[PDB]
């Protein structure tokens, strides 16, 4: 079990760690989060009590180093840092645990939610979407725009998701205009799966990462990317049966976890009614259709 210590908590802030969150008062004796499960990526995220504008946070994998949080009063935010001195770090953590000034990652044992939301998400792929190679962890916030959003302005700070565009030469073979536009299987299976992603795990990993950035930071370009990757599968007549079964499980847990009060902004009516009721896969997403109908019947 790993730990992310905090130097201090100088400003009042809501801290999240994966799907959990807690309120820390200004100058409360908070020194971090312990008992973090190893084997999964994680996200630690922040909303200041003064300026709920800008949710921001850090994706990290405790197997890639020792990481801590330290508030920077010049840039005005909680920053993740790596500690290279291994003995210095174990020493800091042990002292903080002894004084019991760390909260515990509060995972219930029956609960597989975080695994089910991050099953295909890898740090190495996060780091190619979020390019900042001097760090082992990745910063994301509400305002970051996507590479495709920037084609339609600071490149260093972009989300480099895979560009999907249904009315593009990449998507449409010459001479198959109608066929490829109404049945996107060749764009899904040959262009994206075989060509760009290599396998469905990498595709699912980017889909899951896009959802999580949409949910935790309200990142609009990430929500666009999540729906695009859903729609590309739903609009394909020919999808490996294993991908369809896994997609149903993936979306089930995303819909289960979404806050009921954010569904108005985070869910796109058109994509969902197409996936569930018009598309080739209208009969293939049983778990997702049942949870959507019982939790968001208004949307449909």
């Amino acid at each position: 079990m790993n730990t992310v210590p905090f130097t201090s908590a100088p400003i009042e802030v809501t801290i999240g760690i994966d799907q959990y969150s807690f309120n820390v008062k200004e100058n409360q004796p908070f020194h971090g989060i312990k008992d973090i499960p190893i084997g999964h990526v994680h996200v630690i995220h922040f909303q200041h009590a003064d300026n709920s504008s800008m949710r921001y946070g850090y994706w990290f994998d405790c197997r890639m180093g020792n990481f801590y949080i330290q508030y920077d009063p010049k840039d005005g935010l909680y920053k993740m840092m790596e500690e290279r001195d291994g003995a210095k770090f174990e020493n800091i953590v042990h002292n903080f645990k002894e004084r019991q000034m760390m909260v515990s990652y509060p995972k219930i044992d029956e609960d597989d939610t975080w695994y089910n939301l991050t099953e295909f998400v890898q740090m190495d792929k996060i780091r190619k979407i979020v390019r900042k190679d001097e760090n082992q962890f990745s910063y994301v916030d509400s305002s970051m725009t996507t590479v495709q959003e920037n084609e339609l302005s600071d490149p260093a700070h972009s989300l480099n998701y895979t560009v999907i565009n249904f009315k593009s030469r990449e998507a449409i073979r010459p001479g198959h205009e109608m066929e490829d536009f109404l049945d996107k299987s060749y764009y899904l299976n040959t262009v994206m799966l075989q060509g760009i992603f290599k396998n469905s795990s990498n595709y699912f990993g980017e889909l899951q990462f896009a959802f999580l950035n949409a949910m935790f930071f309200g990142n609009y370009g990430s929500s666009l990317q999540w729906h695009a990757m859903i729609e590309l599968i739903c609009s394909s007549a020919t999808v490996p049966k294993h991908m369809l079964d896994k997609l149903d499980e993936i979306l089930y847990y995303q819909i289960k976890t979404l806050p009921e009060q954010y569904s108005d902004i985070l869910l796109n009516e058109r994509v969902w009614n197409i996936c569930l009721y018009s598309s080739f896969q209208k009969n293939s997403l049983h778990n997702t259709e049942k949870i959507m109908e019982n939790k968001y019947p208004e949307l449909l």
């Binding site: 030469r169 109608m178 536009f181």
Partner: protein
Amino acid sequence: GAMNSSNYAELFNNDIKLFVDDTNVYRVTVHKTFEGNVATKAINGCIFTLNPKTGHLFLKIIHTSVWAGQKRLSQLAKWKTAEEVSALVRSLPKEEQPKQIIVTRKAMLDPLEVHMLDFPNIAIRPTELRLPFSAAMSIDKLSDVVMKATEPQMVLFNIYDDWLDRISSYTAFSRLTLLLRALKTNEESAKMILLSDPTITIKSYHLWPSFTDEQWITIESQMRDLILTEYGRKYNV
């Protein structure tokens, strides 16, 4: 953006543009079968592709053989239209290619946009006007030639005859739309108006009679009356 009442004179500027109507591409008669079920029999159709400034009518005849063995024909018809429009543009030299294509029905937007991906500098636009181009098959010579075709074929007419020698393109387009609106509301009366006086003939290469300026004013007036009426005879006013 969309073409409408406010940006109407843009049609007659010097940027080349084509109006594409697909209404008459897929045409059927509906009949009973021996068993008492209903079936369709397709008949020849046409794409109506018009330069509103010069009057060029590129009439691509759609022969019923293109539907043989195909499913979902109303949807195919939109993609076939877009295929044929893209082919016409690709044939045209770069300086003669249109900068805009305005489709008369919104369902043509995505089929045309996909077929024109090679032409990113050609704007595809809808319109908010309820233009009467469906009535082009009420033009005797058009109805007759599309029905005589035994194979796919590209037929050419000037839908303004020689009008541009005497009037502007704005005025010619307005005259065309009035004639077509009339033919669409009451084809019988409209055609009676146009051919009542035997002394006014149609030249071999023209669609409409050789009216003098003064006779056109009378004609245009009669077509207005027709349309107001049929609106009464329909709305009881």
